[PDB]
Design an enzyme around this catalytic site. Sequence first.
Site, mmCIF file in Angstrom:
data_model
loop_
_atom_site.group_PDB
_atom_site.id
_atom_site.type_symbol
_atom_site.label_atom_id
_atom_site.label_comp_id
_atom_site.label_asym_id
_atom_site.label_seq_id
_atom_site.Cartn_x
_atom_site.Cartn_y
_atom_site.Cartn_z
ATOM 1 N N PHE A 14 2.547 10.008 4.620
ATOM 2 C CA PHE A 14 3.016 9.678 5.954
ATOM 3 C C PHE A 14 3.594 8.278 6.086
ATOM 4 O O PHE A 14 4.446 8.075 6.950
ATOM 5 C CB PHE A 14 1.880 9.870 6.974
ATOM 6 N N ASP A 15 3.191 7.323 5.247
ATOM 7 C CA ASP A 15 3.754 5.979 5.311
ATOM 8 C C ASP A 15 3.512 5.282 3.980
ATOM 9 O O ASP A 15 2.554 5.584 3.269
ATOM 10 C CB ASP A 15 3.150 5.176 6.487
ATOM 11 N N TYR A 26 0.818 -1.201 0.000
ATOM 12 C CA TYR A 26 0.000 0.000 0.000
ATOM 13 C C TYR A 26 0.858 1.260 0.000
ATOM 14 O O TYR A 26 2.089 1.213 -0.028
ATOM 15 C CB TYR A 26 -0.953 -0.013 1.199
ATOM 16 N N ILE A 46 -6.136 -1.226 11.607
ATOM 17 C CA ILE A 46 -7.238 -0.316 11.903
ATOM 18 C C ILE A 46 -8.505 -0.808 11.198
ATOM 19 O O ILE A 46 -8.444 -1.547 10.199
ATOM 20 C CB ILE A 46 -6.859 1.131 11.519
ATOM 21 N N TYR A 95 -7.978 6.101 13.455
ATOM 22 C CA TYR A 95 -7.461 6.335 14.804
ATOM 23 C C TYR A 95 -8.239 7.376 15.606
ATOM 24 O O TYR A 95 -8.162 7.361 16.839
ATOM 25 C CB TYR A 95 -5.996 6.745 14.719
ATOM 26 N N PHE A 121 -5.591 5.749 1.487
ATOM 27 C CA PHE A 121 -4.613 4.691 1.272
ATOM 28 C C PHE A 121 -4.674 4.202 -0.168
ATOM 29 O O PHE A 121 -5.732 3.779 -0.641
ATOM 30 C CB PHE A 121 -4.850 3.522 2.224
#
Lengths: 820, 375, 107, 384
Positions: free
Chosen positions: C36-37, C26, C56, C82, C99
Amino acid sequence: MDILELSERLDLQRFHSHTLRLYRAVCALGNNRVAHALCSHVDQAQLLHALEDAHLPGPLRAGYYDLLISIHLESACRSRRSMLSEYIVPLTPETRAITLFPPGRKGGNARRHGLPGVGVTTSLRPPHHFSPPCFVAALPAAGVAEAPARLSPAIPLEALRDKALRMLGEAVRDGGQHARDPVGGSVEFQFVPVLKLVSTLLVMGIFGDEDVKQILKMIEPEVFTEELEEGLLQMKLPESVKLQMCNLLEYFCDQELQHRVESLAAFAERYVDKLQANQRSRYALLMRAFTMSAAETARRTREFRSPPQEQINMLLHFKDEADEEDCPLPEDIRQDLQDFHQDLLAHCGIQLEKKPQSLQELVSHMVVRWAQEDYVQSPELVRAMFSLLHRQYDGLGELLRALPRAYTISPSSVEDTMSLLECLGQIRSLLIVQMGPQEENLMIQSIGNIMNNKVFYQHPNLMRALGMHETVMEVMVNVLGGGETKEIRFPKMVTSCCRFLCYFCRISRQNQRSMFDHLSYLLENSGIGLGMQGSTPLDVAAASVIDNNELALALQEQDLEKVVSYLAGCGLQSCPMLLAKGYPDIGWNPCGGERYLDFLRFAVFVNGESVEENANVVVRLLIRKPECFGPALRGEGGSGLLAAIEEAIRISEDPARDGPGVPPEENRVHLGHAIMSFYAALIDLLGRCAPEMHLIQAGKGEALRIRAILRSLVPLDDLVGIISLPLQIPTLGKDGALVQPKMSASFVPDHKASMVLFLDRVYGIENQDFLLHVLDVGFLPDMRAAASLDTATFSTTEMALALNRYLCLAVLPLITKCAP
Amino acid sequence: ACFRMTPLYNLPTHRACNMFLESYKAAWILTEDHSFEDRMIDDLSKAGEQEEEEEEVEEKKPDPLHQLVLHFSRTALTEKSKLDEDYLYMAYADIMAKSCHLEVEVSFEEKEMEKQRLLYQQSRLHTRGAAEMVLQMISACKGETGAMVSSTLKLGISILNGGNAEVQQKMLDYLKDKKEVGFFQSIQALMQTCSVLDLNAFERQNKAEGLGMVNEDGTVINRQNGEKVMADDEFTQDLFRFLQLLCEGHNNDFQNYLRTQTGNTTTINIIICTVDYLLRLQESISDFYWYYSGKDVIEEQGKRNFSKAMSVAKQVFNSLTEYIQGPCTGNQQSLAHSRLWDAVVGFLHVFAHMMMKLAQDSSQIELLKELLDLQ
Amino acid sequence: GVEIETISPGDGRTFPKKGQTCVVHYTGMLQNGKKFDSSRDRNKPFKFRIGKQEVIKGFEEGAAQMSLGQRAKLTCTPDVAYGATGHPGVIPPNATLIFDVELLNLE
Amino acid sequence: LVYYEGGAVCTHARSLWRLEPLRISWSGSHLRWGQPLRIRHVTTGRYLALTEDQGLVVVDACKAHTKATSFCFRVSKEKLPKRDVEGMGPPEIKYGESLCFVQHVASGLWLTYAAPDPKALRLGVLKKKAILHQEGHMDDALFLTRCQQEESQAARMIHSTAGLYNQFIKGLDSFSGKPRGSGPPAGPALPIEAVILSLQDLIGYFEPPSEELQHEEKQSKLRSLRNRQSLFQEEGMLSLVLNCIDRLNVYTTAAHFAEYAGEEAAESWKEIVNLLYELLASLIRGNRANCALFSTNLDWVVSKLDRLEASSGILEVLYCVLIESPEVLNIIQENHIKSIISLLDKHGRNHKVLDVLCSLCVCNGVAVRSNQDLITENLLPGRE
């Protein structure tokens, strides 16, 4: 904008390099919770590309290299590094294969010296813990202070070590060309970050055997041969990279020290088998020695009637060749040891051409060449250089100082040893962090793992060698230092570690003796420790001298003076802990007084016999401080010893005076009971420090003086009254409901036990009139109370059991002694 | 227990190796003698292949030994409340101290050769600032007794042996121009902290010896662990040896310095303080004798205690002699008006009863002759 | 809860059901457009056991609809994300997560 | 009031007495016993005196008439002024020897510690109050010791500086309110030029030694700098300088300062507020005890971090507090973290702010996880 533009934009360069300094700051000293967060802003790709980015500026290149070390490598490195000073060598088949020299045929005394850091090492170092940094994983159900400790973010170390090796080779080749544009803008910015990465990986042991071979080739390609091209030691380097060079050589010198220790352990494994076999065979021949000898066999069986410590000394007591008569070992075994000592000193280069031909001579020549080339201006570089130089020359010395931390263990306990070392690493890693609730639960669960660990009892010598007690006490100094005046924060860890220290002393005499050296250190910190309940630091001090006559004798006089002065303050001031919960104010603290008196009892009582030297010293201080006895026995405006008991019973019986009046809290202080028990603790101290019968019969002047003074203090009537006090016996009523009074707020036989022991040791029983005069009023109700409570129901109750231990500790031995 | 305890061959292999290691080091590593100090100092003291240029400036950048001495002088001169122990300094002060001394009608010729080689060994150090380094570290120690100041005094002794005149001159000049009071504040503090004979400690030691402590994993027979009586006797002897070496050779300029300091704003009279320590020693000797006055025979531990207490008193008397010889009229007037006489009377009283007490037995001739040369 | 927009659909036949691990490669991004990631930076596929609530809720419920070799853009509200507590030090409170999931393979 | 005290208390400037003889000419002549001479305290500008109500006190310089203030030294206590000499004089009294007894010239009284001790001194450290006794005990002999010139100079400038700024504070609070508007100032003119010159003199007086110095003499000046800072803060000057900023910070801008003080002082308002922080920074720099005083009023600087008159000055003062006192980090809370982070968003990308943040994480090689989580929580996820 391209980050390479910061090589000209010096305004952004300073800020961004300081930003990378903040990135290291927020993840420094094992804050792996934040170190996982940093993987979002600076992921693995940027860091790895920034390593090889040859046009990055100076501060930025060193910033990212240090950032990578701080984020992914610092936490694992520091914990491993703290374990590099300990050698717990298990006895394993590949441990046996460890030899001081590699196989060769160069010479009998010593072959060519092996490659440092190359081979197999069996010393136990716990494996590193890493976690793959993932942010889409669900938030843990457990919150702070309950979740397991976060592990360091993961990074492929197998690829990273190859990258570091390749770039180090690139830097060596580039440095040889003496180009006018070194990577990063300068030689220091070219070599320092990559040597830092190489050193950190070397310390962690990520590099393999061939990787170490390559690193030695780049350091020096000719000295480290196995059987421009210039090494890193011939490059005319600045002072800053010389420090990292010293760190690199320091790691190899630690490898040589560890190799010598491991070789010694392997030699121990080989030698003990032949030593025990020869001694066992000689045991059989000594049993048949009676066929050709006589009563002079004591000269031969002295070894077998002597414990093994000096047996091995006698066995190995043949080095100077003038003492071969006491050694029964045959000369082949003696030759074996003398040969291993010969190549041991050869491996240390004691004794037995510009080529250094070895690491020790290479480092020594390199350091002295550096020093004489120019005046070194960095004090840290100077200290590192001479530290290496001293370690090369004093090869035997470093082995000598490394042996006390060495230890050999059975292979069957390695799985518990690694878990113990992991727990020890947790405690060591917590010495550099401020008090925190999450940090508080970490050592508590680690200490509990130490208690459940069987090696903690099986090998207490190894426990002392690792020296966890110093770390635990340093933690105590840290927590007692924080909030040293207002309140001792975080009591849960305080009682857990003090419980561990108390449990540590009772393991063995040597552990207790070692802990005893911190008595004064603990005593100063025990001044504010009275705000703690449970496993107080004073209990650790008391357990440090329990049942040890030699330690009790060696205990100093001012330590007892300080304790009595604190007891004086207890007897003249109220307890701040008691006033905190709302207890009504009185002029003295009985609970703190009893706590001091218990240690005083242990200070002068050893195995049933009083210590006269400690006894006269402590009692003299009590004589000089009249207020230590309490509200009674004060003299000026004082009341009788018996007189303070009825009012103490009045306070215990009548509520709203025994406490705040707002156990209910399971540790609720009973003020009446505490007053009623302080007298018991004081009198038990006075009884247990009494001069012995043989001293009184011998008529020593101070012995009689002390006994006469003590007899003058306490009148005999007050004793008879306290002994004659009726007992609140648990009676039966309201449909078979056993009405047992509260054991912490009722008349218990503990107070009377100190009365009877006091009279027996001090006053004694002389005539029948005095014997029956105390017997009818004091022990007669007790005996009938026990007879009444002797049944199928009451005997299981605590009070009847208390009488059962009573009669047989206080009355019956007194009656047996006073039978005629 | 000894006759029914577990024989050696039945011990576990790991345990059997454990005390084997400590026995091997105690019997083969401690006993092993390796002399590397002289060749290591020679390597550090030789200037190698940079004087060949013969630069016009002749800036004379330090050789490695001088750089090492400068580094220790720097860390000594750091403004710090507590002087932390440095294992590096301890090992290098020891190496420097052991690299100097190197030690039947032997003639005056080769004895002079040995002397002029000893001054060569000391010259290898004192020309490189080691003399000022010792003074600095004594001042920086702030009168805190320890294994680091002991090695500092041991180095000063080793670089002062035979009363090196130039070394004393350099030390006097350094104290005169620096005008640091802390050197004598620390010297006074160390000397006051020096211990005397203790009756209570002796009685406790005797009882501990009567008990005979033993271990669990085996047994140690008559353990010779750290004696609590005259533990710092070696340090006290070193301190007074160093003070005697400072004024040896009738260095009246330094003898006046010990009595009083013109440069310093506050004056510490070491001579009278030395008398004060002699007083504390004379009370300790008198009381410890009084414990043996009733006893007919003096046992071995008491003999050892006298052997070291008298050795310290011998060193103190040698130092006191060195303060007044020359003659130094200032020190003579100071000792005349000091409390020296009471200590002299006390020793005379101890001596008189003592020689007769040791005269009725032949097992104390060794101790008696140490009292003969002390008096 | 989650909004899925297909990007490079694959077969559309086989879906990751309960019982087998889900291996996604992903790329995560905040709603403001700042990444961010990801997993391509780490160069290792993200393998997560389905149904164990280790990931999550938004990601877990989203991952079922794509098939093998299907790449889709998800959109997870803070409720399925979150939320108010956020991710400490990474994701600010009450943030919507996008995502770029690519279910490259199963097992 | 006069006291006998021990320990390291009197190594400061409060225990310096000036022997001032009655003779205007040849006042530096050698002391001979039995002469009239005054005693003065340098840091307070007051003279020892015999008062009727309180016995032995210090009286102001305008009420020392040589009757109750002068004292005479005597070699012993035996019952016996001498004519002055127009020359150097005979050297009699020495330093640390030749014990002297001090008797009042007029009343004949003798200095003596007060034997009674209250309950405060029963458990606490003794401070024997000096009562001028009629005869005195056996051991009232006093020893005279030399003090070094630089600290004597520092002692004098403490009284000079204290009086100068106390007058400046007394000027500022006079027109703390009462807006001038378009009229004249409230009272006397502010000693702005005297203050400015005194500030710049003390800033260079407390200037740290340069790095280019020899590494041995450098730390000798470090020792002098710490000693100067210790005496200055112990004499209350550090407590005094904070009040100056407190008085001057109530005005937002120069025009707002003009409306309460005047246009003449409005031009120098920015200069004086800039210099005051510099003096505070030089006073507290390198001293852990002085920096420890900000652990109680840490929020004081944090609230003023957004003041535009001196942003770098207050930031430097903050840096000096953090870099030296480890305990301040434990007092640091979420409010301060958000304030410091707000500095980046309001004053631009100042790298010194990041230096403050780096000092917030670790101190003395010890981690502070109570602050590290706050920094990474309030700064990193924003990505702005």
